[PDB]
Amino acid sequence: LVHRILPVAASYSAVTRFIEEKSSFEYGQVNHALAAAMRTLVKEHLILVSQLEQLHRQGLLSLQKLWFYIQPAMRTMDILASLATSVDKGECLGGSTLSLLHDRSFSYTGDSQAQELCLYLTKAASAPY
């Protein structure tokens, strides 16, 4: 059961490294802003786990309950990890990291949950360029 829960743990460690690496000066003006827009999405992922821990203090939490609670964070950190690896693997700086985000906005168009996250990251990364 914890093997099913651990993908959101693996899709968190590959996001914090991307923001820690692409906040360096050599990565231009826009890949700075792409690692900028993901950290407000890191904030909510932490807030859920602290609230679950304080709930766990009262003993009113189960392993099945936790696996029910973290279902949106498993999706949102996965889209951030997909964008993180797609910018890292194909070296994307400036306008090239502005094309790939516009492609993922067309990939997710009918979900309207992963679209809004991706469309938020496009408008935030398009500010310096």
Added chain:
Amino acid sequence: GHREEPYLTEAGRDAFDKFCRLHQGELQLLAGGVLQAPQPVLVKECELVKDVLNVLIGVVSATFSLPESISSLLSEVAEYGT
């Protein structure tokens, strides 16, 4: 008082499960080693419910790999999780 030595059809949940393993052993004797149908025990009710409800999530368990009629009742919901 000296009560009516539990009439069979009312006295179960231990005496009926004792009784199931009795007819199982009788059929095994009428076969003579060529049947050998064990495991007439184990375990409980609620944890088996969390177990079978877990099978719907794809999960592996103690009796899910990858009386005695609960195997048929369990197959009807095992093949759902497959």
